[PDB]
Design an enzyme around this catalytic site. Structure first.
Site, PDB file in Angstrom:
ATOM      1  CB  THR A   1      -0.954   0.029   1.211  1.00 49.49           C
ATOM      2  OG1 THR A   1      -1.931  -1.009   1.070  1.00 49.49           O
ATOM      3  CG2 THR A   1      -1.671   1.351   1.296  1.00 49.49           C
TER       4      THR A   1
HETATM    5  B1  LIG Z   1      -1.917  -2.155   1.923  1.00 48.64           B
HETATM    6  O1  LIG Z   1      -1.178  -3.343   1.295  1.00 48.64           O
HETATM    7  O2  LIG Z   1      -1.184  -1.920   3.251  1.00 48.64           O
HETATM    8  C1  LIG Z   1      -3.372  -2.700   2.323  1.00 48.64           C
HETATM    9  C2  LIG Z   1      -4.161  -1.547   2.924  1.00 48.64           C
HETATM   10  C3  LIG Z   1      -5.611  -1.890   3.210  1.00 48.64           C
HETATM   11  C4  LIG Z   1      -6.181  -0.915   4.222  1.00 48.64           C
HETATM   12  C5  LIG Z   1      -6.425  -1.818   1.935  1.00 48.64           C
HETATM   13  N1  LIG Z   1      -3.281  -3.781   3.285  1.00 48.64           N
HETATM   14  C6  LIG Z   1      -3.168  -5.050   2.905  1.00 48.64           C
HETATM   15  O3  LIG Z   1      -2.886  -5.359   1.763  1.00 48.64           O
HETATM   16  C7  LIG Z   1      -3.381  -6.115   3.935  1.00 48.64           C
HETATM   17  C8  LIG Z   1      -2.068  -6.839   4.180  1.00 48.64           C
HETATM   18  C9  LIG Z   1      -1.027  -5.886   4.709  1.00 48.64           C
HETATM   19  C10 LIG Z   1       0.116  -5.625   3.960  1.00 48.64           C
HETATM   20  C11 LIG Z   1       1.078  -4.749   4.447  1.00 48.64           C
HETATM   21  C12 LIG Z   1       0.897  -4.146   5.686  1.00 48.64           C
HETATM   22  C13 LIG Z   1      -0.243  -4.412   6.438  1.00 48.64           C
HETATM   23  C14 LIG Z   1      -1.207  -5.287   5.949  1.00 48.64           C
HETATM   24  N2  LIG Z   1      -4.360  -7.083   3.492  1.00 48.64           N
HETATM   25  C15 LIG Z   1      -5.197  -7.672   4.337  1.00 48.64           C
HETATM   26  O4  LIG Z   1      -5.315  -7.306   5.491  1.00 48.64           O
HETATM   27  C16 LIG Z   1      -6.016  -8.832   3.861  1.00 48.64           C
HETATM   28  C17 LIG Z   1      -5.409 -10.059   3.636  1.00 48.64           C
HETATM   29  N3  LIG Z   1      -6.152 -11.086   3.215  1.00 48.64           N
HETATM   30  C18 LIG Z   1      -7.465 -10.944   3.006  1.00 48.64           C
HETATM   31  C19 LIG Z   1      -8.078  -9.717   3.228  1.00 48.64           C
HETATM   32  N4  LIG Z   1      -7.341  -8.687   3.652  1.00 48.64           N
END
Ligand SMILES: *[B]([O])([O])[C]([C][C]([C])[C])[N]C(=O)[C]([C]C1=[C][C]=[C][C]=[C]1)[N]C(=O)C1=[C]N=[C][C]=N1
Lengths: 229, 245
Positions: free
Chosen positions: A1
């Site tokens: 993100t």
């Molecule tokens: B981004 O990659 O940080 C995103 C932001 C969210 C608010 C849309 N988060 C995610 O991709 C997260 C994983 C993550 C990555 C890096 C730091 C923190 C978290 N994804 C999930 O929480 C997720 C995983 N599997 C199913 C559904 N959601």
């Protein structure tokens, strides 16, 4: 993100990628990390996909119940003290980096960066997410304050595209929206029309000469691309 | 048999005297409202009269906003109407958090009639001496269009839809004008200009004064702009001339 929000004279420009990834697999490649609170106040959204979604629609219901009882417009500083209150009394249980940016007629364009610790800092531009650490030295060199609305859109699209080229967590589309005294204008440019990518970067065309031919000299002459020669 | 009328107790003829005495708190301020829905809009007119000239006239109002697609007027005891607005704003918001969609107008009228039934069954609680009129436009099914809605809840809890309603002092002469007008045309085919003339003339036939445009305030909801908003005073003047024609 990789999320960011940049202020110009009129209002603000929100910018974000589109990818939620469970560790190493792309669960969604068309996420929407730009969450509507009111008509002119949005928030960027990083970290846990569930913990920040529950905060964003709990603030947006306090904020619309406030707007009806007041009978006027909501200030951006009002919406940024409802995330700070919730991200601080839940800071050991959630993972939430929020960038609140919007427009109000009193203060113009406002940008509030609320990190995972739960603090609130009012800024000119904000960065957030795991891909934001690439963009500090990019904004120290290439960013000049006081751009127009059309220049901040093309800059923030060029800013995110350098972020998800190196970051593995980030990628996908580039979702941007501008919040000012006009109607909120959104724009989603794809990957194949992104302003930057390393695959078409003309300095990464030459392969690094790793696979040397078996030869008589130390003169490095490029990779070995065929079994005969 | 000692009191028969002082708390929520059935009379020997089977009535509640604290319900019948709260209907009289509606006609006691002496005001009046008329609501009507045309083919594509909803209107609510109400008497907005300030007797003192030293009163700021844009503070005293009966038209409230419950949610951004539902408006209401409160006809009765004026601080009781402000109380039921704050109740309906809680129910419309807690519907939004729990269920994710905006509250239907027929459901917000039912959940406010259940709040009025509890206050007339427990002995200690006073009934709200105010008739609410929640107006809005609901999402129709099987075609996706919008549809005009008027809903009225009594102090007892009698909810129900309406084509045209009236509340306040001399509400009987306002019903009698609307039913007399109903015998000729069909009110669900009229336009917004035509239906505005009837609700203002119904407010004229009861007060017998042919009031000014500042002595009323009108709120409306239209199929093009579904949000509740009150009209400008310049648009009331374009309607009051047509009633005199
Ligand atoms: B981004 O990659 O940080 C995103 C932001 C969210 C608010 C849309 N988060 C995610 O991709 C997260 C994983 C993550 C990555 C890096 C730091 C923190 C978290 N994804 C999930 O929480 C997720 C995983 N599997 C199913 C559904 N959601």
């Amino acid at each position: 993100t990789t999320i960011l929000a940049v202020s110009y004279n009129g209002g603000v420009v929100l910018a974000a990628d589109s990818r939620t990834s469970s560790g190493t697999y792309v669960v969604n490649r068309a996420s929407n990390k730009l969450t509507k609170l009111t008509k002119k106040i949005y928030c960027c959204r990083s970290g846990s996909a569930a913990d920040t979604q529950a905060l964003a629609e709990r603030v947006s219901n306090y904020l619309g119940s406030y707007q009806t009882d007041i009978g006027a417009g909501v200030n951006v500083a009002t919406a940024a003290n409802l995330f700070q209150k919730m991200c601080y009394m839940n800071r050991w249980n959630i993972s939430a980096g929020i960038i609140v940016a919007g427009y109000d007629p009193i203060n113009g364009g406002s940008v509030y960066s609320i990190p995972s610790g739960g603090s609130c800092v009012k800024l000119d531009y904000a960065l957030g997410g795991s891909g934001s650490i690439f963009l500090y030295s990019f904004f120290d060199a290439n960013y000049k304050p006081g751009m127009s609305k059309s220049e901040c859109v093309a800059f923030c699209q060029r800013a995110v595209a350098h972020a998800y080229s190196r970051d593995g967590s980030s990628g996908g589309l580039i979702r941007t929206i501008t919040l000012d005294a006009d109607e909120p204008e959104d724009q989603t440019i794809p990957w194949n029309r992104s302003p930057y990518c390393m695959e078409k970067d003309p300095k990464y065309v030459t392969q690094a000469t790793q696979n040397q031919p078996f030869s008589s000299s130390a003169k490095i002459t490029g990779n070995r691309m065929s079994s005969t020669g | 048999a000692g009191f028969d009328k002082y708390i929520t107790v059935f009379s020997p003829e089977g009535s509640l005297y604290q319900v019948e005495y709260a209907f009289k708190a509606v006609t006691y301020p002496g005001l009046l409202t008329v609501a009507i829905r045309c083919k594509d809009a909803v209107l609510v007119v109400t008497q907005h009269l300030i007797p003192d000239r030293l009163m700021r006239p844009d503070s005293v109002t009966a038209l409230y906003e419950v949610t951004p697609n539902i408006g209401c007027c409160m006809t009765g005891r004026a601080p009781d109407g402000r109380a039921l607005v704050q109740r309906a704003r809680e129910e419309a918001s807690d519907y939004q958090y729990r269920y994710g969609v905006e509250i239907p107008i027929a459901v917000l009228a039912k959940r406010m009639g259940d709040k009025a039934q509890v206050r007339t069954q427990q002995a200690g609680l006073r009934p709200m001496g105010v008739v609410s009129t929640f107006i809005g436009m609901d999402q129709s099914d099987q075609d996706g269009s919008l549809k005009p809605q008027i809903y009225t809840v009594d102090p007892a809890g009698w909810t129900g839809g309406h084509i045209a309603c009236a509340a306040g002092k001399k509400q009987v002469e306002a019903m009698a004008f609307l039913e007399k007008r109903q015998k000729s045309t069909e009110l669900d085919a009229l336009t917004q200009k035509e239906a505005a003339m009837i609700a203002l003339a119904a407010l004229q036939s009861a007060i017998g004064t042919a009031v000014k445009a500042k002595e009323v305030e009108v709120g409306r909801c239209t199929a093009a702009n579904p949000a509740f908003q009150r009209v400008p005073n310049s648009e009331v003047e374009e309607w009051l001339t047509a009633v005199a024609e």
